[PDB]
Amino acid sequence: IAIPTNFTISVTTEILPVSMTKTSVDCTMYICGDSTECSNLLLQYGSFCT
Amino acid sequence: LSFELLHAPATVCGPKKSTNLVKNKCVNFNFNGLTGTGVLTESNKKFLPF
Numbered sequence: 001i002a003i004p005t006n007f008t009i010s011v012t013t014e015i016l017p018v019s020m021t022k023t024s025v026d027c028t029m030y031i032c033g034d035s036t037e038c039s040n041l042l043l044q045y046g047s048f049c050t
Numbered sequence: 051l052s053f054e055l056l057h058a059p060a061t062v063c064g065p066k067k068s069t070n071l072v073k074n075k076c077v078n079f080n081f082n083g084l085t086g087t088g089v090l091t092e093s094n095k096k097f098l099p100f
Contacts, residue, residue: 034076034087 027049032038042049071077071090078087 028039028042031049032042073091074089076087076089079085079090
């Protein structure tokens with residue numbers, strides 16, 4: 001058998017992500033900017049932005 | 051006065067009007083063919099002359 005006659009105390013680092021960046025997108029402003037008729041066309045696609 | 055429309059880049063065109071409404075107004079704007087909509091604000095940018 002082999003038995004230890006001494007010890008070492010080791011500190012080791014573990015790294016874990018917990019969060020992302022909370023991002024939001026204004027669907028209408030992304031797709032159509034400030035064009036009224038582009039927005040009207042976008043209404044034809046329903047609830048995709050929602 | 052004879053007028054000819056060749057394929058070469060059109061050179062002679064009549065005068066064009068002009069108006070302004072600058073700050074804190076949502077305006078459709080046409081700056082020398084650059085068309086858009088938005089609010090115009092004075093800027094600190096430093097465009098090169100050209």
